[PDB]
Amino acid sequence: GSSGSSGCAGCTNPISGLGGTKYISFEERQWHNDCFNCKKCSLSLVGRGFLTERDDILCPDCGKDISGPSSG
Ligand SMILES: [Zn+2]
């Protein structure tokens, strides 16, 4: 029971997109006021300085302390 897989990049569902919704809109990707959460700690990013990972999003806390590849 789905309409379309184009809208919020979180709940695999379309966004209201009617005329002034409290949703998150990015350069290309998008999310909801709730769905919009880190990809490591799933923390509330709505209204914050979230980051942009390769193919995912993250929060300043995580992005700042990203384990990264095999390094020190
Ligand atoms: Zn959503």
Ligand SMILES: [Zn+2]
């Ligand atoms: Zn995080």
